[PDB]
Amino acid sequence: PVPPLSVRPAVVMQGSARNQDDLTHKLADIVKINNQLRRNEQNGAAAHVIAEDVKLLQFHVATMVDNELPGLPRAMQKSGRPLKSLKQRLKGKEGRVRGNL
Amino acid sequence: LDLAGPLLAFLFRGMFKNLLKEVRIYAQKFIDRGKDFNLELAIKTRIISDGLKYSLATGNWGDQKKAHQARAGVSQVLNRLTFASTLSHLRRLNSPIG
Amino acid sequence: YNGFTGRKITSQIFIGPTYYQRLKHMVDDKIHSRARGPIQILNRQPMEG
Amino acid sequence: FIQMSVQRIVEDAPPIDLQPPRYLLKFEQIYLSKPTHWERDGAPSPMMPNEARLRNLTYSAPLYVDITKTVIKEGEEQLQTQHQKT
Amino acid sequence: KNVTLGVPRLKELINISKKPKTPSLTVFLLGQSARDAERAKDILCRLE
Amino acid sequence: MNAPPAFESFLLFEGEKKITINKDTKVPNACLFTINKEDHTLGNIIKSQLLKDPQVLFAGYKVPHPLEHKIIIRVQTTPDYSPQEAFTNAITDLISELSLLEERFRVAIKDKQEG
Amino acid sequence: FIKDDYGPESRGFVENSYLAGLTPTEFFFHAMGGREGLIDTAVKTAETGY
DNA sequence: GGCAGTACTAGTAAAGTACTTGAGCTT
RNA sequence: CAUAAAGACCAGGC
DNA sequence: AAGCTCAAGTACTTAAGCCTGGTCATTACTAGTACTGCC
């Protein structure tokens, strides 16, 4: 699933440019490597490269849900700031459950 | 106790090693031809200047890409409320314990 | 002596100069009042601060 | 920090070994001057901290290190160029 | 003898912790061991 | 920002009566005066003057709150004597005292200088 | 104080009263005595609220 | 006039609990 | 009637 | 040999309530394209 723009609103800066939520960029990665995997399924490649792309795709798909997993490198969007996973959105104090409800 | 000297030294060493590191990178990559070598194009001052200025500016103390591992709390903005508050803020200790 | 009626105050009150400090905290900056103002973008809830 | 430690960090760093010709780099000594601003035109001017606050400048000094460079061409002559105020 | 009291003991009770910081067992004596300190001393030796 | 201007103390704006009069049903022959825009300066005078009158059973004043400028004076008199008459008589007596005090104070001034 | 002094003064018994005022060592011991109170005040609140 | 090099601009990395797990001892 | 983002750390208040 | 329970070993967790200010940086590297200079 891809959540609506309401769940992941953009960031309007001065009207010059629109920044984007952690999701939008994460889904961007998922679509990039998903498309690469589609193409390399049409070609067939060397077939271990497929395994590599399914492991990295595993990293993105499983990372968007949980960025706090131990034993795995935690995805870094930019600026040395880790992503906010849906779990991180719904979990701690100021998360939707305890914070907004 | 870590004052300006030991702190700014610990900060200056690694940055200086990044300076030497990019002198090695640009150096060797410019050497592989065997043409010649030029120093003034191999040194980036943004390293030392922007690094010192940064880690003094934000207060996060260490490499900025490592800022997670880097200690924070050093170099707060000085309090101008009262001359007593300033004399107090200039003379202070901070325990690293959480 | 009492201020209002001028009668003596029976007990003898302790008077002297002492040095007092006004503090940065002042009510004019701590007062806030809220009726249906700006709203947070993501939560559709009132703003913070 | 300035009068001791910085010379220790510059000196105690290993000489740069590189390479067939060889390229070696060594840092002789380090020199500071009073805080100075290099403007948009490149004109240096001494900064008093007042104008440093008012303009949001950074009050800082330029840092110069002599750099001796040795090249080994295998011809028995290794040519060293020394550069002042790098 | 001391006993944990207040907030920490309340944590031990509410948490139903496996090992409390100060476990204690009070013991009463039926017979002449109760009033006389001698037989009481005997039970003191037998419980320790 | 919420500070009232320097006058809530005396100046009356539109509609406020200086004196308002309300009868008191708790007791027969007792009345209650409300003086807008005054404080203990006047009320202490009037109360202390009403306690001399032998026909006045009760005389009292209060400010219900200092940040508001108001006075409440309860007066209870003996039968067949209106408390309003006691309050008028009180004021008239007060003037009769203050004028005399002015004149004697002027005589004292003129005596202390070359006298 | 001299090593191995268990006397009332060395171990923090305060003879003076706030009116007469403390001696310096009794003042420092007194500050130690108050620090525990401040620390208890700060620490207990979180556990109590939780 | 064509080719090469350099620079600039735009993509892009304490304690305490439960839970599990491995070993150790028996029908 | 709309725009000033979000986040981060730090200082402080009860 | 199967299976049984019981021991240590290991991973993983949450840590007060509300409120007020400020500073700060949103990235720095690599690749590609365009422009200028030299042959």
UniProtKB/Swiss-Prot annotation, chain D:
Assembly and binders: Component of the RNA polymerase II (Pol II) core complex consisting of 12 subunits: a ten-subunit catalytic core composed of POLR2A/RPB1, POLR2B/RPB2, POLR2C/RPB3, POLR2I/RPB9, POLR2J/RPB11, POLR2E/RPABC1, POLR2F/RPABC2, POLR2H/RPABC3, POLR2K/RPABC4 and POLR2L/RPABC5 and a mobile stalk composed of two subunits POLR2D/RPB4 and POLR2G/RPB7, protruding from the core and functioning primarily in transcription initiation. Part of Pol II(G) complex, in which Pol II core associates with an additional subunit POLR2M; unlike conventional Pol II, Pol II(G) functions as a transcriptional repressor.
Covalent S-S links between cysteines: none
Family of the protein in this entry: Belongs to the RNA polymerase beta chain family.
Name the UniProt record assigns to this protein: DNA-directed RNA polymerase II subunit RPB2
Gene source species: Bos taurus
Full protein: residues contained: 50 to 147 of 1174
Signal peptide: none
Localization per record: Nucleus
Functional summary from the UniProt entry: Catalytic core component of RNA polymerase II (Pol II), a DNA-dependent RNA polymerase which synthesizes mRNA precursors and many functional non-coding RNAs using the four ribonucleoside triphosphates as substrates. Pol II-mediated transcription cycle proceeds through transcription initiation, transcription elongation and transcription termination stages. RNA-dependent RNA polymerase that catalyzes the extension of a non-coding RNA (ncRNA) at the 3'-end using the four ribonucleoside triphosphates as substrates. An internal ncRNA sequence near the 3'-end serves as a template in a single-round Pol II-mediated RNA polymerization reaction. May decrease the stability of ncRNAs that repress Pol II-mediated gene transcription.
From Swiss-Prot, chain F:
GO biological process per UniProt: transcription by RNA polymerase II
Gene3D superfamilies documented for this protein: RNA polymerase, RBP11-like subunit
Residue numbers bearing the N-acetylmethionine modification: M1
GO cellular component: nucleus; RNA polymerase II, core complex
UniProt-annotated location(s): Nucleus
HAMAP family named among the record's database cross-references: RNApol_arch_Rpo11
Subunit structure: Component of the RNA polymerase II (Pol II) core complex consisting of 12 subunits: a ten-subunit catalytic core composed of POLR2A/RPB1, POLR2B/RPB2, POLR2C/RPB3, POLR2I/RPB9, POLR2J/RPB11, POLR2E/RPABC1, POLR2F/RPABC2, POLR2H/RPABC3, POLR2K/RPABC4 and POLR2L/RPABC5 and a mobile stalk composed of two subunits POLR2D/RPB4 and POLR2G/RPB7, protruding from the core and functioning primarily in transcription initiation. Part of Pol II(G) complex, in which Pol II core associates with an additional subunit POLR2M; unlike conventional Pol II, Pol II(G) functions as a transcriptional repressor.
Biological function: DNA-dependent RNA polymerase catalyzes the transcription of DNA into RNA using the four ribonucleoside triphosphates as substrates. Component of RNA polymerase II which synthesizes mRNA precursors and many functional non-coding RNAs. Pol II is the central component of the basal RNA polymerase II transcription machinery. It is composed of mobile elements that move relative to each other. POLR2J/RPB11 is part of the core element with the central large cleft.
Protein name: DNA-directed RNA polymerase II subunit RPB11
Protein encoded by which gene: POLR2J
